[PDB]
Amino acid sequence: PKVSVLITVTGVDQPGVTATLFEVLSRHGVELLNVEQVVIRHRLTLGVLVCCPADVADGPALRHDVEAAIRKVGLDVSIERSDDVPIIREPSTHTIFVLGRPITAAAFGAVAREVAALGVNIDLIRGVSDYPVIGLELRVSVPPGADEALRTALNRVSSEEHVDVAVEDYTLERRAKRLIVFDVDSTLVQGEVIEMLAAKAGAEGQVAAITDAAMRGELDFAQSLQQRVATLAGLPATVIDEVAGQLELMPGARTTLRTLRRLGYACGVVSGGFRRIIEPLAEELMLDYVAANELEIVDGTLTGRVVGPIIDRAGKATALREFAQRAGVPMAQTVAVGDGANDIDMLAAAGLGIAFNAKPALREVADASLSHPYLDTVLFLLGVTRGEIEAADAID
Amino acid sequence: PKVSVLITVTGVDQPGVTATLFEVLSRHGVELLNVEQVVIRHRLTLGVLVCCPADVADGPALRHDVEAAIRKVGLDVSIERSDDVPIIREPSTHTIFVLGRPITAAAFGAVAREVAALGVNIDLIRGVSDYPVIGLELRVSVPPGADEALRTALNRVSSEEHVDVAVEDYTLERRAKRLIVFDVDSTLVQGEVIEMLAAKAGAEGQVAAITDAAMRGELDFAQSLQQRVATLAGLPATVIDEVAGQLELMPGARTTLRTLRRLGYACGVVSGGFRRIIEPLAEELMLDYVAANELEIVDGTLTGRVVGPIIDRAGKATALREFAQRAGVPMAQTVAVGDGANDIDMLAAAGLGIAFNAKPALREVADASLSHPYLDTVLFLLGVTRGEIEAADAID
Numbered sequence: 077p078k079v080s081v082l083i084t085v086t087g088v089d090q091p092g093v094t095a096t097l098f099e100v101l102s103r104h105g106v107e108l109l110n111v112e113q114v115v116i117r118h119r120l121t122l123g124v125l126v127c128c129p130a131d132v133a134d135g136p137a138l139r140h141d142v143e144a145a146i147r148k149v150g151l152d153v154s155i156e157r158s159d160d161v162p163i164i165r166e167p168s169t170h171t172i173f174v175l176g177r178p179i180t181a182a183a184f185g186a187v188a189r190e191v192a193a194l195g196v197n198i199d200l201i202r203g204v205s206d207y208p209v210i211g212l213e214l215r216v217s218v219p220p221g222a223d224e225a226l227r228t229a230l231n232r233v234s235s236e237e238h239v240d241v242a243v244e245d246y247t248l249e250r251r252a253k254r255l256i257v258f259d260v261d262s263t264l265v266q267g268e269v270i271e272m273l274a275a276k277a278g279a280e281g282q283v284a285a286i287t288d289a290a291m292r293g294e295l296d297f298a299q300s301l302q303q304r305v306a307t308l309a310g311l312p313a314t315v316i317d318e319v320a321g322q323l324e325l326m327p328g329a330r331t332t333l334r335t336l337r338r339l340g341y342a343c344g345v346v347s348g349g350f351r352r353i354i355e356p357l358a359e360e361l362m363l364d365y366v367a368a369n370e371l372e373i374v375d376g377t378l379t380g381r382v383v384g385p386i387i388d389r390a391g392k393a394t395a396l397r398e399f400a401q402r403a404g405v406p407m408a409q410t411v412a413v414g415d416g417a418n419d420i421d422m423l424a425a426a427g428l429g430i431a432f433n434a435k436p437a438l439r440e441v442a443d444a445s446l447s448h449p450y451l452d453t454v455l456f457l458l459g460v461t462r463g464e465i466e467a468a469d470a471i472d
Numbered sequence: 473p474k475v476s477v478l479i480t481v482t483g484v485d486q487p488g489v490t491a492t493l494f495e496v497l498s499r500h501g502v503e504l505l506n507v508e509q510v511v512i513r514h515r516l517t518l519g520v521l522v523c524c525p526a527d528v529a530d531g532p533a534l535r536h537d538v539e540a541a542i543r544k545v546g547l548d549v550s551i552e553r554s555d556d557v558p559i560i561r562e563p564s565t566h567t568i569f570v571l572g573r574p575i576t577a578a579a580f581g582a583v584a585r586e587v588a589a590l591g592v593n594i595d596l597i598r599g600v601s602d603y604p605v606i607g608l609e610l611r612v613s614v615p616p617g618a619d620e621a622l623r624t625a626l627n628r629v630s631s632e633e634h635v636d637v638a639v640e641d642y643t644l645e646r647r648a649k650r651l652i653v654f655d656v657d658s659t660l661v662q663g664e665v666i667e668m669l670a671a672k673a674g675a676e677g678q679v680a681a682i683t684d685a686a687m688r689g690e691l692d693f694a695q696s697l698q699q700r701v702a703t704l705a706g707l708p709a710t711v712i713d714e715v716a717g718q719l720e721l722m723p724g725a726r727t728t729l730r731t732l733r734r735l736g737y738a739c740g741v742v743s744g745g746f747r748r749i750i751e752p753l754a755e756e757l758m759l760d761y762v763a764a765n766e767l768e769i770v771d772g773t774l775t776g777r778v779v780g781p782i783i784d785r786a787g788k789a790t791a792l793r794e795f796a797q798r799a800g801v802p803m804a805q806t807v808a809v810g811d812g813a814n815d816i817d818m819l820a821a822a823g824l825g826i827a828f829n830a831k832p833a834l835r836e837v838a839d840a841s842l843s844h845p846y847l848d849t850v851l852f853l854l855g856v857t858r859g860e861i862e863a864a865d866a867i868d
């Protein structure tokens with residue numbers, strides 16, 4: 077172990093190259109400092125930093141043994157005294173997810189040039205999904221203080237090209253996420269429950285219009301919920317179970333929750349909706365925490381009011397904190413997914429706030445935006461790949 | 473998107489290749505199915521599966537545009553209608569850690585040939601540490617039912633070549649480990665506390681001899697603890713604090729625990745030793761769970777007995793289970809690290825049982841064995857790299 081030598085083997089993948097190389101090196105006094113190898117589309121690259129006696133490195137036996145063995149079977153090898161080279165690359169600082177249906181070449185090219193223009197190095201690119209959407213990951217090394225610019229640059233690329241682009245800190249701490257909360261309406265569940273209750277009153281049109289104004293930040297949430305629930309005054313309480321049994325999970329929601337249990341996440345829901353509807357489901361979904369509002373009932377009939385206190389925008393953040401404290405999870409390790417301005421405060425306080433098919437008020441504040449109608453695209457933003465989900469699911 | 477074409481770019485890394493390629497492809501009707509890229513020791517490989525109109529794929533414009541752009545600046549590119557190729561590789565089944573000081577070429581070559589002989593494909597090799605030991609990772613794809621043979625083959629390589637070799641399941645579930653327990657004596661802490669107590673009685677020689685016989689499985693643990701603690705009959709109870717203040721953490725133990733808190737592990741200790749000594753420390757180390765034995769004291773003096781019930785070999789497993797149930801962690805997601813036959817049952821029940829500088833009885837039963845005097849080599853077996861630990865620590 078006097079001097080360091082770098083051996084690099086490239087060419088068309090073949091059986092036995094890795095084994096052949098280290099057997100040859102063992103006829104010389106070689107100890108390993110670092111080995112990197114990958115095969116991409118049958119192209120092999122094998123990089124080996126070793127140290128050996130200055131005697132062997134300075135003489136032609138090591139080189140002739142390596143070169144003859146590698147060249148004989150079809151590949152190429154270079155050999156060079158390094159001494160100055162890094163031993164082992166540093167970790168990426170950040171990771172970038174690109175989700176599209178499709179992802180065009182132009183979309184990806186724009187990301188790559190956006191990245192380059194900021195002096196960001198691409199350390200790795202891989203696929204993470206081929207269904208329900210194409211998903212691609214770039215691990216990168218961002219110059220210090222450039223990552224605000226990078227998110228800004230990539231959000232434009234995202235809108236201009238019709239791909240989701242999420243930039244996420246790739247450090248040990250920030251990526252040990254352990255706790256996720258979903259908004260219910262238009263996030264975990266298709267549609268808006270309060271609209272399904274109002275349909276029982278022939279008020280769906282009015283309620284839906286107030287809901288869209290509320291979910292765009294156009295109306296104060298508390299006022300908007302009182303106006304909407306009022307249209308329910310007089311309906312019998314039986315209507316709750318009825319709507320409860322009508323609900324449909326967002327597509328990919330079961331996969332999302334099941335996969336997140338495999339990873340040991342605490343899972344909960346924070347809703348402006350109604351505990352009597354969400355609890356039946358949270359229990360069916362084996363959740364750990366429910367926060368919701370409560371409908372007032374008199375003589376088995378809805379009064380058109382809710383029983384305070386009301387979970388408003390600020391209250392959803394407050395439930396997240398409460399959930400994180402009870403679970404023993406620092407807030408930087410929490411995930412919130414929602415769709416409306418109702419969720420702005422909850423996404424800001426979460427470690428990672430995901431806007432799922434969201435109104436512009438939310439998209440503008442989220443750490444990340446998803447634009448396709450599959451809730452399991454959340455799994456890709458949490459470092460999970462399609463193939464891994466299918467492996468786990470197939471093993472049962 | 474009628475047909476699938478595979479573009480593969482290889483050569484010496486340069487600025488702009490990724491960006492150049494996708495800009496060229498955007499002048500044709502190209503959508504992305506999969507992108508893999510890495511640079512190893514300045515050798516770039518970029519593999520791109522796309523789909524485009526059968527018109528563009530069948531004509532020479534796409535090829536001449538790609539070939540001219542890539543060749544102009546120094547690299548090579550191939551282009552081929554695929555249609556039959558996989559879109560996105562499957563995940564590895566297992567991962568192999570090779571720790572050595574040093575790792576010789578012969579050691580690594582033996583691993584590579586052992587792997588090959590069982591029909592195991594190496595999907596990736598990377599470095600995970602350059603200090604305190606050289607650490608290398610191979611992600612592999614093991615034929616179903618071959619992994620018992622693989623562990624067997626690699627354990628021989630390990631002893632024959634003086635490297636630790638750990639084979640670990642690389643599935644989503646089994647690698648979301650969330651809970652670790654350490655044995656104390658000769659694991660988290662240097663030396664054997666009961667030997668430090670006996671030194672106060674001039675009994676160290678006898679106690680140490682009984683301890684080594686007990687830690688090799690030669691003696692029943694319960695009998696061996698009674699004989700040893702008896703030599704303490706008559707010492708004043710003050711001797712506990714004294715030894716407490718003398719203790720030295722295993723080297724790298726602070727890094728191990730700190731890094732494991734960053735990842736959100738529940739951390740505890742299970743010891744045959746004495747709660748009055750371990751508690752002062754567990755609290756100093758911010759642990760979540762302590763299990764230990766209790767020294768009997770009369771009139772401020774040790775009687776030479778322990779206050780049952782005694783944590784024996786079976787009792788350490790029982791505390792692990794108890795700890796896992798209280799924390800909400802399935803046993804397949806738990807980690808136990810120990811050194812003596814005292815820990816055999818605890819390592820068997822844990823998801824991953826690590827033998828740290830252990831007696832042969834333990835090594836023979838552990839999922840993994842570490843042979844170097846740094847407890848932070850545990851972090852490498854849990855998927856953490858040296859560079860990541862240093863990044864996190866530098867960020868404070």
Ligand SMILES: c1ccc(-c2cnc[nH]2)cc1
Nearest residue numbers: 197198485486487490511
């Ligand atoms: C050094 C500089 C740039 C790159 C690179 C980034 N994207 C493709 N190659 C890789 C290493």
Ligand SMILES: c1ccc(-c2cnc[nH]2)cc1
Nearest residue numbers: 261268269270287348349
């Ligand atoms: C804002 C908009 C809709 C809702 C809701 C719909 N169903 C239950 N709550 C709650 C707040």
Ligand SMILES: c1ccc(-c2cnc[nH]2)cc1
Nearest residue numbers: 089090091094115593594
């Ligand atoms: C297919 C077959 C073998 C390999 C390989 C394993 N180790 C080095 N190359 C890679 C792909």
Ligand SMILES: c1ccc(-c2cnc[nH]2)cc1
Nearest residue numbers: 657664665666683744745
């Ligand atoms: C077996 C051997 C030693 C010990 C021990 C040493 N110090 C505290 N307990 C416990 C069991």
Ligand SMILES: [Cl-]
Nearest residue numbers: 350351352371
């Ligand atoms: Cl309710």
Ligand SMILES: [Cl-]
Nearest residue numbers: 746747748767
């Ligand atoms: Cl005690």
Ligand SMILES: [Mg+2]
Nearest residue numbers: 259261262415
């Ligand atoms: Mg909603």
Ligand SMILES: [Mg+2]
Nearest residue numbers: 655657658811
């Ligand atoms: Mg011990």
